[PDB]
Write an enzyme that holds these catalytic residues in place. Structure first.
Site, PDB file in Angstrom:
ATOM      1  N   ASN A 110     -15.187  -4.861   3.720  1.00 49.41           N
ATOM      2  CA  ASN A 110     -13.849  -4.862   4.350  1.00 49.41           C
ATOM      3  C   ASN A 110     -12.919  -5.586   5.400  1.00 49.41           C
ATOM      4  O   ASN A 110     -12.387  -6.066   5.781  1.00 49.41           O
ATOM      5  CB  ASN A 110     -14.025  -3.574   5.655  1.00 49.41           C
ATOM      6  CG  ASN A 110     -13.530  -2.069   5.201  1.00 49.41           C
ATOM      7  OD1 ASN A 110     -14.541  -1.008   5.464  1.00 49.41           O
ATOM      8  ND2 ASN A 110     -12.905  -2.374   3.991  1.00 49.41           N
TER       9      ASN A 110
ATOM     10  N   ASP B 192     -14.710   0.183  10.360  1.00 43.76           N
ATOM     11  CA  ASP B 192     -15.817   0.253   9.339  1.00 43.76           C
ATOM     12  C   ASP B 192     -15.920  -1.199   9.089  1.00 43.76           C
ATOM     13  O   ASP B 192     -15.215  -1.457   8.410  1.00 43.76           O
ATOM     14  CB  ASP B 192     -16.028   1.232   8.446  1.00 43.76           C
ATOM     15  CG  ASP B 192     -16.854   1.600   8.163  1.00 43.76           C
ATOM     16  OD1 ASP B 192     -17.952   1.196   8.769  1.00 43.76           O
ATOM     17  OD2 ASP B 192     -17.150   1.833   6.779  1.00 43.76           O
TER      18      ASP B 192
ATOM     19  N   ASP C  20     -10.186  -3.207   8.611  1.00 37.20           N
ATOM     20  CA  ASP C  20     -11.196  -1.863   8.161  1.00 37.20           C
ATOM     21  C   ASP C  20      -9.838  -1.052   9.125  1.00 37.20           C
ATOM     22  O   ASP C  20     -10.517  -0.721  10.037  1.00 37.20           O
ATOM     23  CB  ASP C  20     -12.083  -2.030   8.243  1.00 37.20           C
ATOM     24  CG  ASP C  20     -12.281  -3.213  10.334  1.00 37.20           C
ATOM     25  OD1 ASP C  20     -12.006  -3.755  10.204  1.00 37.20           O
ATOM     26  OD2 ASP C  20     -12.926  -1.868  11.158  1.00 37.20           O
TER      27      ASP C  20
ATOM     28  N   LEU D  84       2.030  -5.320   3.580  1.00 40.59           N
ATOM     29  CA  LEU D  84       1.198  -5.960   4.059  1.00 40.59           C
ATOM     30  C   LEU D  84       0.201  -7.741   3.588  1.00 40.59           C
ATOM     31  O   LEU D  84       1.170  -7.790   2.272  1.00 40.59           O
ATOM     32  CB  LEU D  84      -0.657  -5.710   3.027  1.00 40.59           C
ATOM     33  CG  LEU D  84      -0.384  -4.026   3.173  1.00 40.59           C
ATOM     34  CD1 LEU D  84      -2.374  -3.638   3.304  1.00 40.59           C
ATOM     35  CD2 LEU D  84      -0.617  -4.115   5.309  1.00 40.59           C
ATOM     36  N   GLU D  85       0.002  -8.237   3.918  1.00 38.15           N
ATOM     37  CA  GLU D  85      -0.235  -9.815   3.473  1.00 38.15           C
ATOM     38  C   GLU D  85      -1.082 -10.668   2.899  1.00 38.15           C
ATOM     39  O   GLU D  85      -2.630  -8.361   2.748  1.00 38.15           O
ATOM     40  CB  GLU D  85      -0.557 -10.530   4.906  1.00 38.15           C
ATOM     41  CG  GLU D  85      -1.893 -11.801   4.433  1.00 38.15           C
ATOM     42  CD  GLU D  85      -2.194 -12.453   5.827  1.00 38.15           C
ATOM     43  OE1 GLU D  85      -2.719 -13.787   5.746  1.00 38.15           O
ATOM     44  OE2 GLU D  85      -2.569 -11.896   7.113  1.00 38.15           O
ATOM     45  N   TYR D  86      -1.234 -10.842   1.754  1.00 36.26           N
ATOM     46  CA  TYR D  86      -2.131 -10.312   0.850  1.00 36.26           C
ATOM     47  C   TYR D  86      -2.722 -11.561   1.120  1.00 36.26           C
ATOM     48  O   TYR D  86      -2.765 -12.931   1.859  1.00 36.26           O
ATOM     49  CB  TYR D  86      -1.328 -10.975  -0.887  1.00 36.26           C
ATOM     50  CG  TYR D  86      -1.989 -11.587  -1.867  1.00 36.26           C
ATOM     51  CD1 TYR D  86      -2.067 -12.305  -2.577  1.00 36.26           C
ATOM     52  CD2 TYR D  86      -3.124 -10.066  -2.832  1.00 36.26           C
ATOM     53  CE1 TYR D  86      -3.550 -13.073  -3.586  1.00 36.26           C
ATOM     54  CE2 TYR D  86      -4.336 -10.777  -3.637  1.00 36.26           C
ATOM     55  CZ  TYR D  86      -4.043 -11.798  -4.337  1.00 36.26           C
ATOM     56  OH  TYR D  86      -4.956 -12.059  -5.211  1.00 36.26           O
TER      57      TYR D  86
ATOM     58  N   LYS E   7       0.746  -1.018   0.064  1.00 34.57           N
ATOM     59  CA  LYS E   7       0.383  -0.202   0.105  1.00 34.57           C
ATOM     60  C   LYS E   7       0.768   0.967  -0.509  1.00 34.57           C
ATOM     61  O   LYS E   7       1.737   1.135   0.931  1.00 34.57           O
ATOM     62  CB  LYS E   7      -0.992   0.083   1.168  1.00 34.57           C
ATOM     63  CG  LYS E   7      -1.864   1.462   1.694  1.00 34.57           C
ATOM     64  CD  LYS E   7      -3.091   0.549   2.125  1.00 34.57           C
ATOM     65  CE  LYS E   7      -3.759   2.287   2.100  1.00 34.57           C
ATOM     66  NZ  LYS E   7      -5.083   1.712   2.709  1.00 34.57           N
TER      67      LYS E   7
END
Ligand SMILES: COc1ccc(C(=O)Nc2ccccc2)cc1NC(=O)CCSc1ncnc(N)c1Br
Ligand SMILES: COc1ccc(C(=O)Nc2ccccc2)cc1NC(=O)CCSc1ncnc(N)c1Br
EC number: 2.7.11.1
Lengths: 252, 252
Positions: free
Chosen positions: B134, B129, B147, B83-85, B35
């Site tokens: 999410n 959220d 989220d 991040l983990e996929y 990201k």
């Protein structure tokens, strides 16, 4: 009480508080404020039951720094709130007039606010948006809380609980921050994070980024700085506000 | 880690999660999601310090039902989240495919959600959220919370504290309601208060007004009804969800 018990006069608050009128009880000649709510609007918002709970609680409370709800009634299409009339207008209007408040006036208002907010917490009275426009002034110039009327900032609508959509999220910790903002605005004439755009105001709040003018004294700076903590648990409590040296030295 | 350690592939999530790309670590060939956050945007939002606190906490956590943050780095103009996929897509996509979930799949997802939310509360992990879009799905089809990215419904902007504007108001009690909404949506195919207009959805939430289709069993009705309480303090706790008879009977 019935509608026929009242003479209805001029509208109050230029619609900022909804349909509110200066009124007089016909038999006693007592001056008060009458707020008119349309059932169709209450029904469309889904707030009938929540309103009932709140006015039930309010109608049994008395406090010199909370605007009083004397009672309520209804007819086929409306609900009527019988309110205390605050003769001296809003704190907003007074701040507009004076530009800023002296240390005595400010400390006295903060004491009164702290007392009102404490009482609301202990008696489980919901209040919704503390700001000068929502603060009224009594016959003796005493401050009175009146903030009771009602993708999002809280997330996606379909997933949000009633306490979020009903504006019921101003708890004790939230109120501590509000009190810090108000103390600053009383002394300076504007809230600390005010900016031309919403984005810039957002930025300033998140960063806790503000400056004191030179005329703000050490004691007032200590109070304000101890309330405006990014971390909610670190904020000075209402009890601690009432015992703060600056408050003690300056409050009427 | 540096940008040069990664091969950047196709964009993920159609912008719903910001600038996210399928990526591969060049030396190990490990597949992950990267990201990209623009510092100019972080600066303009005032979120740099809050983001730092959150990623610091996340980068030390591991839980099978929370999307993992492996680490982070930055350059002159960007911050990068490693991040983990989640290979199986979102729960939203799966619900779209199947229309609704059976009792086994639902109870298993609710257990996983409850476990993730419990862990977030105990380790002070902010989430923002909870909704099917999410919620992501791992290699073995296990649910993973994702989220974390970020006049108002909370009142007037200038008077609001950082926790309100930073979306940090989903506490344990809020989450209980979210879990009830999610349980209903998993079983039925739509959240309980969904309506064409925001006003009508508002009304339905405040009234706690919803109906169960005939195919929703007694046990599922008991769970959902005990979570969707107008009064926050009355809602079934996460511990109590995990011990509910319907959950015990149906969870994998
Ligand atoms: C105890 O005061 C209230 C109690 C309740 C509600 C209320 O609407 N609740 C509510 C209504 C619908 C839905 C959910 C909540 C509102 C107020 N108060 C007000 O509206 C203030 C009216 S303006 C005013 N009043 C006196 N003197 C002045 N000089 C002025 Br100006
Ligand atoms: C631990 O996961 C996060 C941790 C933090 C933040 C974040 O932005 N924090 C944040 C950023 C700026 C300001 C304030 C908070 C975001 C995420 N997660 C995400 O953005 C999810 C990316 S979408 C995706 N990921 C994997 N597999 C897929 N199939 C998909 Br689709």
């Amino acid at each position: 009480w019935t509608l026929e018990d009242f003479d209805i006069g001029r509208p109050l608050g230029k619609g900022k508080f909804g349909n509110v009128y200066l009124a007089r009880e016909r038999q006693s000649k007592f001056i008060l404020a009458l707020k008119v709510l349309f059932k169709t609007q209450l029904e469309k918002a889904g707030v009938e039951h929540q309103l009932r709970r709140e006015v039930e609680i309010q109608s049994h409370l008395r406090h010199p720094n909370i605007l009083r709800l004397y009672g309520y009634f209804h007819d086929a299409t409306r609900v009527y709130l019988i309110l205390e009339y605050a003769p001296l207008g809003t704190v907003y209007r007074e701040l507009q007039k004076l530009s800023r408040f002296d240390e005595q006036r400010t400390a006295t208002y903060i004491t009164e606010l702290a007392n009102a907010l404490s009482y609301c917490h202990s008696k489980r009275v919901i209040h919704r948006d503390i700001k000068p426009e929502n603060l009224l002034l009594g016959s003796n110039g005493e401050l009175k809380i009146a903030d009771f009327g009602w993708t999002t900032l809280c997330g996606t609508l379909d997933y949000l609980p009633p306490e979020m959509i009903e504006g019921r999220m101003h708890d004790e910790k939230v109120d501590l921050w509000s009190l810090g903002v108000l103390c600053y605005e009383f002394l300076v004439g504007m809230p600390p994070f005010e900016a031309h755009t919403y984005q810039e105001t957002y930025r300033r709040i998140s960063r806790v980024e503000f400056t004191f003018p030179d005329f703000v004294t050490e004691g007032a700076r200590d109070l304000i700085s101890r309330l405006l903590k990014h971390n909610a648990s670190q904020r000075l409590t209402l009890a601690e506000v009432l015992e703060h040296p600056w408050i003690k030295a300056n409050s009427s």
